[PDB]
Amino acid sequence: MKRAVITGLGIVSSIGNNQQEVLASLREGRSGITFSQELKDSGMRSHVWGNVKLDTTGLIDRKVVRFMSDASIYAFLSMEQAIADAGLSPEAYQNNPRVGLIAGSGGGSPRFQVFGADAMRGPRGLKAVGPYVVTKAMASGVSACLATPFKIHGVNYSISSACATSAHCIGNAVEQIQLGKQDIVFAGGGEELCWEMACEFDAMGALSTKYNDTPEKASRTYDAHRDGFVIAGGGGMVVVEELEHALARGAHIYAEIVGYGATSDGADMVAPSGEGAVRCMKMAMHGVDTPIDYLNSHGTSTPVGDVKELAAIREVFGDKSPAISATKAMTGHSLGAAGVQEAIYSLLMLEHGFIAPSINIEELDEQAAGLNIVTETTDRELTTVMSNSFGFGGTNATLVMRKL
Template sequence: MRVGETLLLVAAVAIYGGHAFTGGVLNRRSETVPSTGTPVSSQSTETPGFSSAGATGAGTVGTVALAALGALSAAAARSRRVTSLVSRAAERRVVVTGMGITSCLGNTLDDVADNLKNGNSGITFSEEYEKLGIKSNVRGRPNLTPAEIKELIPRKTLRFMGPNAQFAYIALDRAIQDAGLKPEDYENNERCASILGQGGTSIPDVTESCGYVADQVKRWPSKVGPYRVTRTMGSTVSAVLSSAFKLQGPSFSISSACSTGAHCIGVAMEQIQLNKADMAVAGAGENECWQFTAMFDCMGALSTKRNHEPTKASRAFDKDRDGFVIAGGGGMVVLEELEHAKARGARIYAELTGYGANSDGYDVVAPSGVGGEKCMKIALAMADEIAGEKQVDYVNTHGTSTPIGDVQELGAVKRVFEEKGYQPYVGSTKSMSGHALGAAGVHEAIYSLLMMDRGFLAESINIDDLVDEADGMKILTERHDGGVARVASNSFGFGGTNACLVFDKFEAHGKGGRSLSLVAAEPMRVVGIGRENQTDRNITSFTEFRCRKLLQRDRRVEGQVNTTQGEQWNVKRSACASRAEKATWTTRRVLRGSLAVLLALAAILTTPVAAEIFGNFSLDGLSQGAAFVKKPIVAGLVEILEPVMCESLPPALIKTFKDERMACSMVCMMEHMMANPDFVKVLKNFISTSMTNEELLGSLKEVMRDALSDSHLYKSAMHGVANSLNPLHSETLGKMFSRKDKSDSPRPS
């Protein structure tokens, strides 16, 4: 019997950590427990914080059991705070349901996909650039005439726009159509976010306005007009589009050079994960104009060697590359929370599972490579946490065709995947599209999604002589046909700003991934239990208070729990005559349910070393068990909490145990603690001390028998255990905790 009791105690300590009892019953120093009057000192304990004599006291429920209960109550309360931000982020899956684009590769998804598949370049020669004396005479401009733009954009909206906002508007309009959204789905909808950006402003409007004033053109105020300000704001795209489409959710602009579009998508993802929105439109627009091109040309950043072979000018990863080809356009994606998308029957292109963002902190224009490497690791780690570990099939690199940038990025990609033991396919769609600056990130996200959706990977064209740095890598010098499950898209910009997006092929039935480990990163602490000079009655009152508060919170949070459970709890508790009886009844009922769960968890955790469970207890076995049966633990906990458990646990606590992700996080936390030699040393000492304390064991035995006296609870607990243990273990466990009294009569005192 001692082994089983100790298992229960260890389960409480292991799940919630030694920190759960900080300031609690097990951390008292030279204080008196009223039920026995026995001084408890921790001075002889090898590690401060635990009592060498154990926690004495054989009150109504036992102080150790109350400490476990306090940990459980604290977990239930804390889950309301922590999981509301972090666990919820993992639970709210984000999917792509619509795309729209304006680019030199086409202004429809079909045209873009065809050009990608056939390796067609959208780069053209510019007579305008040549006449102005700009050394680079090549560009990538969307094939949209002024007349077509006027037809596609309402006049009242168009007057506020520069070219960047025009390209973005058309892309957003088509993304909404592609997503099958109706005006009532997004207009005046506070749950629809719009995270829209631009790399630069409308420089033509700035230069024209300045020219009119500087040259003192006759009636220059009328030529400048009232709309130049809105056209040249750093937030024009966001301001004009959110107004035009009546988007009332979170809305702001991002401008982060060539990473802008990718950052917009990543931040929109976070808005949905944090439950600030159910859907979002995200993307960017960028104009291509001679003014901007001239400035880049003076930096020496543009390709100048192949002005008369424009389709061969952009050649990422080729030894003879000489700079990037400037481009413009716009791109937009519609993101939705998965259940929101499913509820309206939306088509799902892919799931957005990873987003990384950081800074090189190195140089304004030269990339370090290290920052990009770290950024990819952030995004891939997030994708692994949310959707499960799987190989990345394709990386759409930033790959601009610059001498330094290309090799730095190849080195980063190579290092990231060498650590993982494989190399994915690598390519650069900029070889065909040129560099759309602020819109490049969203363009390349759309290119990657189209390739995933249509089952091919585009060739990185114009590679005649592959750079030496690509040795050992799978550079796409020709098209690859076949499905892919995961792709990554990199965007790196001036100032060392980096972004990486990871998309997974959508799986309707989930990925079997884990929740974000941040849920259990901070040890849970019990507040208010076991303070100095606090009696058992005060502890019981605190327990009652916590349960009552949790119940009230459940009632306030609409739809999170079944309020009928709370009503049942109140009716049964009201049957008790006095306040003292109510407090005792509450404590006993919570203990019975909580200990049944801990009993099952303790048995499940030690499954791989069953021989040691019923012989000599092994801490190593506990650690191995945690690593081996993570999924059975979750399955067992869910099975244990059948409807009958609602009679014994407050709804908030049931909600906590039924959360599979939180259960997984508890186990992950326990594994982490068991890997700490100092913690294991403390735990061994604590268990050794506890097993020699007859009063402690007697109290725990009484409480556990009381918890198992309810036949329904016992049956539920054993049913959960049986699902994770083989029949032999279940039978042995049943014999260990066999009891004569299987009645379910209420015991209020």
């Protein structure tokens, strides 16, 4: 089996439009959460979100962007960044059977799905719909919209697994390398931000509703007064590359993907079982001869979910648990984009030797006792980092990344 490394990255998020801006927000413990007039206007109870603060007008060519929803736009721009950051040029990655793309969203595009239906029911029907809704709204929008303009010839599909989507995308990319089928796979995803989708999470009571007057305090993972997650949008993309291929071209290598866990609860639809996560982390830690220095938790800021993961971490590690922070307290929950963005946050912490703070803990949950939850930015020489992604439907992903 071949080894897989990360040789580039790109990110559009609530806390930065590139890796430099994101690095700055992580070290500062800056919140990306703002009041949303759009959410309030729709009749929602959650009025806060992790929005992308970027004018994307003119950033993608007219004939390319016409097929794209926001999830695709966010993923495309991240992919541009990742290509450049990897030091890759068209002659190397384009029209190359051994270079692929695995990237998805959790929701596709509810916005253009609803636009399509709204337009169809109006007096102009098909003519008001137009010819571009399928590529905007289909579940595989994110992969279809990137593989075509980037001239990808290798693998091309999307993995969806709700909150674990882009973490599974990365892990499947690793498998492509291990099987010797691909030299490079761009892995990640994107997620639009809109009332059309967010109202679905509000109607199940999943979103924070009590902190709308103080938007930066709404997302408060592990705080005893958390009341659900803060919904976010954005994209992320990493370049997953075979080790020898990377070394031979003098690539910059952030880390090796040394562990990939993928498991299922087989229990509850919208609540974590715990034992699924335990098995997932163990799978990711298998054969890894170094300790986990830092854990970027799934920790979405939900009453049951936050502490269920903690109980799982305690089971896996015991007394000697790693430093833990939940960056969703800063960023919000970008759903399908969460896995890659959080793999990137963890890689920036690995690369730059620090731990981002788990913010908005005004009163630590009684069930979080005895663990190392890092609440202020602390410089440390990290070697091996772990990222957890647990989604609706009991789907679990865990990534372990280590310096070479």
